[PDB]
Design a protein around this ligand. Structure first.
Ligand SMILES: O=P(O)(O)O[C@H]1[C@H](OP(=O)(O)O)[C@@H](OP(=O)(O)O)[C@H](OP(=O)(O)O)[C@@H](OP(=O)(O)O)[C@H]1OP(=O)(O)O
Lengths: 160, 95, 773
């Protein structure tokens, strides 16, 4: 699968993948708000036929009280494309882009606690550490773990 | 507490200040614009000068706008471009 | 004017409006109106109307503003707020008039020109937006946006070389300023560089790039551009260096392998496979270098490389392996290599329990044989043998009955076969296993929609929609277009044109939204300097409607609208029954067709729809116009030929009452492409040219009856050939022939359709359309 930065031309197919795989769905003007505010951040995994199979919708959260940090607004991969590390490869490309452009320090996300497999991928494969428990975060009334990933190692790995 | 981006999409229309710029040798460049703006206005003035001095048989208009379903302004554009030949225009519209 | 105590309150209404302190904005309105001396003031009644339009109260808004404009119509503010108000209801023609009237009383009012330019760029009036921005550059040459909107204006107009100069004298200001924001400055240069490369100044761009590359935070842009410029100027040593570092960053991206090929210029496959083989070894986990060479490798080189790819994924158990192969199957030479290799895997795993009895490695787990049988069910499904494909995925299910990905293929097999109902019954089981995966949910619902199961599928989607409303309504709220499109096609097939027309119109409303959404980003992006992406959105908004979703909507709508014209029976809520019984179907079908004509001209179905419309309207020069355009893409298209026959036949059979100007244009252009024939020979000629393609036979056997209805026995004899030597004697074309017999396009063939139905059932035994009654 081809992995590449997401351009405005891609966002309508990204929304299609979203509404296929996730219950957390968004409007297109929001998809514009990402690609036109932090364009370097969002990435897609595409077919030979241009069919997006996985995506990452990334964002720089605006907090002046502390260090700059990134936030995954949404991430999903089609079930038809598991065991390909697209989740990992996509999170890596977005994380680096958070460092190059905005000197980002960490990166955050929220996830269903009933989804251990996804959680385990963040926990073991991508070094995502839980920072808090935010209960009934989703409409389902399900508690979401507010994970975090230290980007100090990755940034030093590139300062070389 | 999933915002769905509603709160975020309000940062777009929020009030902001018009940023300004250091004044450095600008009237030099600002005069160069009026050179390219004038030669734009000149070139555009002479394009329509040639188009205006063309015969415009009205019955040709009502035929093109109805057979091609285009508008009067577009039909007038095609006719003047073709120096008032309906066929030589009605043909290019088909293309 | 106003008293300094009652006037300075008006200055508050504006700030409260500029900052969206609306309810506060009403407070200072009441403080001025409750004074009876000014209880009906123009500007105050005007801005209070607008402050109420930013709330729900629009009907009152138009009253208080119009009343306020009536009180004082020589005020620029009163005209200004009328255009602003009208702009919210997308009356641009009128709002732009008020903007001009406003400017007559305030000679050079800045904010009026901004709302004008904002509306001018939205309307794509690029030369007027040029001047409107130029005034802003003349008035305030210190404001940052004044230069940007001007440079944007030239770039949209394709005066690329001028816009580069404009970005330069603006950029000269930024290096001197110490308050410079590094991301904004980085975005500025990358847009300045993008301007140059669009103007063909490749050398100048590279020198520009290097100097400011230190100042550009984005390094994917700096390097992807460098590797592109270095190829243009012949610098293959440096370009190859850049792409190695791009491959290091993202191996999975394809362009970096293609860029390396262009830089290294391999002599042949041997030296070309080394580019990917080096990527195998440097980053072994990556799959892209293991797959890409299978596109050009042939014979022994291909078979050796393919064996590595499958063994790595039949062991690792990758579900999406057949997906990459899916694109490779166009080559039948490579198919037999795959079919033989894997059936080789099959045997050696069943008896000897390893990939090859000769290879010396640890025996493989029982998963690998299943992960094989997963492939061999998707293989024999693509070669049109679902008969054997079922006996694999089934024998694969007895081994493991809890594998969802096994059922998705069980449904896919029936889908490619004729039976949709049986396949949808399998997607039902797949989602029952994992009930939290909306993916399988959506595909089940889609498979259920295709089986004319609207209520069944809504309940399926209802699981993942908001619990405060109907699922269907939630899908309209969230722009779930795969749902509108597959359920509109589902309705239409059930002769419910009312409900199907509903959805086609709901889709266009979405495109109206996404087209309107850009407006708030004209001042936003000029403030954030994300200028590269801002343009790329503007250029996307222009051809927005060519996305495959709208074509799937307009197709259904135009098809439905034609079917109604022939045989007739909070914006406006779209009522189904009202939509179907429309007085002017063809004139509504054109509303769908016009975006197709302007934005997707490379697809022949566009013009062939324009024909079927303009044919029924007797606009002969439009039938000619579209046939010409379809002719330029495929002169032998079967549907195009059906259009050409009727265009040629109706001209000769009805030429006397035509304008002496049509016939002129109608005949010389026709003779250039039609030549001098009659409809029957030009049809016979078409059959002789295309006699081996069944879609072309059916489109001739339809026209021998349209020209000579007494040839019904020839027509049925032409379109029934089941000689396997034919091209596209497939499932869909056969269904079209049986349809055509039932359609009466070939006349009444009650006795004949049965023979074609029971014979096609022999070739697609799982096909519902050929099942006995
Ligand atoms: O999107 P479309 O161009 O209209 O094509 C669809 C569809 O695409 P989407 O799911 O993205 O809407 C399917 O699913 P995916 O692989 O993308 O998940 C794939 O259809 P299946 O559901 O059967 O897998 C199918 O298959 P094919 O590769 O045989 O063309 C193809 O189907 P159709 O266009 O024939 O309906």
């Amino acid at each position: 699968m081809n992995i590449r930065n997401a351009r405005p031309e891609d966002l309508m197919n990204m929304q299609h993948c979203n509404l296929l795989c996730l219950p957390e769905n968004y409007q297109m003007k929001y998809y514009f708000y990402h690609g036109l505010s932090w364009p370097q951040l969002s990435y897609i995994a595409e077919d030979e036929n241009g069919k997006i199979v996985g995506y990452v919708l990334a964002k720089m959260e605006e907090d002046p009280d502390d260090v700059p940090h990134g936030h995954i607004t949404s991430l999903a991969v089609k079930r038809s494309h598991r065991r390909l590390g697209l989740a990992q490869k996509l999170m890596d490309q977005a994380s680096r882009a958070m460092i190059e452009n905005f000197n980002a320090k960490y990166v955050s996300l929220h996830v269903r606690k009933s989804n251990r497999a996804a959680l385990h991928l963040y926990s073991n494969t991508l070094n995502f550490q839980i920072s808090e428990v935010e209960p009934k975060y989703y409409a389902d009334g399900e508690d979401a773990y507010a994970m975090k990933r230290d980007l100090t190692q990755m940034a030093d790995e590139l300062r070389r | 507490k999933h915002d769905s981006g509603a709160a975020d999409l309000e940062r777009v229309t929020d009030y902001a200040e018009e940023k300004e710029i250091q004044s450095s040798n600008l009237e030099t460049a600002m005069s160069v614009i009026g050179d390219r703006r004038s030669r734009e206005q000149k070139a555009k003035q002479e394009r329509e000068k040639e188009l205006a001095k063309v015969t415009i048989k009205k019955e040709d208009l009502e035929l093109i706008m109805t057979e091609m379903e285009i508008s009067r302004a577009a039909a007038e554009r095609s006719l003047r471009e073709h120096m008032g030949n309906v066929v030589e225009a009605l043909i290019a519209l088909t293309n | 004017s106003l008293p300094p105590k009652e006037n300075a309150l008006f200055k508050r209404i504006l700030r409260c409006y500029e900052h969206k302190q609306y309810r506060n904005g009403l407070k200072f309105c009441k403080q001025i109106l409750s004074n009876p001396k000014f209880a009906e003031h123009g500007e105050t009644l005007a801005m209070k109307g607008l402050t109420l339009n930013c709330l729900g109260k629009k009907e009152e808004a138009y009253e208080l503003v119009r009343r306020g404009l009536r009180n004082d119509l020589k005020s620029h503010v009163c005209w200004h707020v009328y255009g602003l108000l009208q702009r919210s209801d997308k009356k641009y023609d009128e709002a732009i008039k008020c903007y001009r009237n406003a400017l007559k009383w305030d000679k050079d009012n800045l904010q009026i020109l901004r709302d004008l330019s904002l509306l001018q760029i939205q309307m794509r009036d690029l030369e007027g937006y040029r001047e409107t921005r130029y005034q802003l550059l003349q008035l305030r040459p210190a404001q940052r946006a004044s230069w940007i909107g001007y440079a944007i204006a030239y770039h949209l107009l394709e005066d690329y070389e001028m816009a580069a100069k404009i970005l330069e004298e603006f950029r000269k200001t930024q290096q001197t300023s110490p308050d410079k924001v590094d991301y904004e400055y980085s975005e500025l240069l990358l847009y300045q560089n993008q301007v140059l490369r669009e103007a063909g100044l490749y050398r100048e761009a590279l020198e520009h790039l290097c100097t400011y590359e230190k100042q550009i935070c984005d390094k994917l842009a700096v390097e992807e551009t460098k590797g592109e410029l270095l190829l243009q100027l012949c610098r293959l040593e440096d370009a190859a260096d850049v792409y190695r570092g791009l491959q290091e960053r993202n191996p999975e991206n394809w362009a970096y392998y293609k860029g390396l090929e262009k830089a290294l210029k391999p002599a042949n496959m041997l030296e070309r496979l080394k580019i990917y083989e080096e990527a195998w070894t440097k980053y072994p986990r990556g799959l892209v270098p293991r797959r890409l060479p299978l596109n050009f490798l042939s014979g022994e080189k291909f078979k050796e490389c393919l064996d590595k790819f499958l063994r790595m994924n039949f062991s690792k158990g990758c579900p999406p392996v057949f997906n990459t192969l899916r694109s490779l199957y166009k080559d039948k030479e490579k198919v037999a290599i795959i079919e033989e290799l894997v059936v080789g895997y099959e045997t050696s795993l069943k008896s000897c329990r390893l990939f090859n009895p000769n290879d010396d490695g640890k025996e493989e787990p029982p998963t690998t044989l299943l992960w094989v049988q997963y492939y061999l069910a998707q293989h024999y499904d693509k070669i049109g043998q679902p008969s054997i494909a079922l006996e694999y995925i089934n024998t694969a299910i007895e081994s493991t009955p809890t594998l969802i990905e096994l059922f998705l293929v069980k449904a896919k097999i029936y889908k490619h076969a004729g039976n949709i109902k049986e396949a949808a019954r399998w997607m039902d089981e797949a989602q029952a296993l994992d009930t939290a995966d909306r993916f399988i949910n959506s595909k089940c619902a889609k498979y259920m929609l295709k089986a004319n199961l609207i209520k069944e599928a809504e309940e399926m989607c209802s699981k993942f929609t908001r619990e405060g409303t109907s699922a269907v309504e939630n899908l309209n709220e969230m722009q779930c277009m795969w749902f509108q499109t597959e359920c509109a096609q589902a309705y239409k097939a059930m002769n419910k044109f009312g409900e199907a027309l509903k959805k086609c119109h709901e889709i266009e409303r979405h495109f109206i939204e996404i087209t309107d959404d850009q407006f708030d980003f004209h001042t936003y992006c000029m403030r954030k300097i994300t200028l590269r992406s801002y343009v790329d959105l503007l250029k996307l908004e222009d051809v927005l409607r060519q996305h495959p979703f709208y074509f799937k909507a307009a197709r259904i709508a135009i098809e439905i609208y034609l079917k109604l014209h022939d045989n007739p029976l909070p914006k406006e809520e779209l009522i189904p029954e009202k939509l179907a019984k429309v007085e002017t179907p063809l004139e509504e079908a054109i509303k769908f067709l016009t975006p197709l004509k302007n934005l997707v001209k490379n697809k022949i179905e566009t013009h062939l729809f324009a024909f079927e419309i303009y044919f029924r309207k007797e606009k002969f020069l439009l039938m000619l116009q579209s046939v010409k355009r379809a002719f330029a893409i495929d002169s032998s298209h079967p549907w195009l030929h059906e259009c050409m026959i009727r265009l040629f036949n109706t001209a000769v059979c009805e030429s006397k009452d035509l304008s002496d100007t049509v016939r002129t244009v109608l005949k010389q252009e026709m003779n250039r492409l039609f030549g001098a024939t009659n409809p029957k020979n030009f049809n016979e000629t078409f059959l002789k040219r295309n006699s081996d393609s069944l879609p072309h036979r059916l489109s001739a056997a339809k026209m021998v009856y349209y020209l000579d209805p007494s040839s019904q026995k020839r027509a049925i004899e032409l379109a029934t050939t089941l000689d396997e030597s034919l091209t596209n004697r497939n499932l869909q074309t056969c269904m079209e022939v049986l349809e055509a017999l039932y359609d009466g396009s070939l006349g009444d063939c009650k006795e004949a359709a049965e023979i074609y139905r029971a014979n096609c059932h022999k070739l697609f035994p799982y096909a519902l359309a050929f099942m006995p009654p």
